[PDB]
Amino acid sequence: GTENLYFQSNAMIERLLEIKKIRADRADKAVQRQEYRVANVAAELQKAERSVADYHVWRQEEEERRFAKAKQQTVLLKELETLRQEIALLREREAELKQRVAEVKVTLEQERTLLKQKQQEALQAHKTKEKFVQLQQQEIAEQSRQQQYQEELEQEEFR
Numbered sequence: 001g002t003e004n005l006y007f008q009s010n011a012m013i014e015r016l017l018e019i020k021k022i023r024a025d026r027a028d029k030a031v032q033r034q035e036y037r038v039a040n041v042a043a044e045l046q047k048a049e050r051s052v053a054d055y056h057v058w059r060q061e062e063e064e065r066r067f068a069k070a071k072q073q074t075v076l077l078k079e080l081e082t083l084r085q086e087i088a089l090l091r092e093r094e095a096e097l098k099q100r101v102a103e104v105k106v107t108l109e110q111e112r113t114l115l116k117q118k119q120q121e122a123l124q125a126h127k128t129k130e131k132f133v134q135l136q137q138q139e140i141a142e143q144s145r146q147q148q149y150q151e152e153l154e155q156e157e158f159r
């Protein structure tokens with residue numbers, strides 16, 4: 001009947017601790033999911049690089065074929081310019097492909113940066129959980145120390 005405040009103290013603490021454990025798990029899971037996002041973007045990067053590498057080879061060839069046709073045929077002006085536009089389009093497509101790689105690389109350093117923040121939060125969530133684990137052990141130590149002292153006095157009610 002008070003100190004029955006230790007029954008409350010300990011329940012408030014257990015519940016707080018449970019909340020902090022829950023926040024720590026959530027923090028860990030946020031990391032795991034973030035590791036997935038990183039791996040996923042890296043895979044996309046890998047594909048994007050493969051695409052430019054491949055395209056680049058055709059683009060060079062396709063461009064040389066068109067310069068050759070234009071040189072080795074005294075072709076008329078608008079065909080000469082249709083060939084120059086084809087080249088432009090071929091090059092724009094490569095530019096788009098190189099742009100995608102750049103964009104994905106930025107995305108990847110951004111995901112890695114977020115992973116880093118998530119890890120920082122997970123670490124803090126864990127430091128906080130442990131802190132509440134200690135508070136709990138202390139609260140139980142006090143309650144325990146209290147309960148013993150009473151008992152040592154109760155012995156003076158018998159022998």
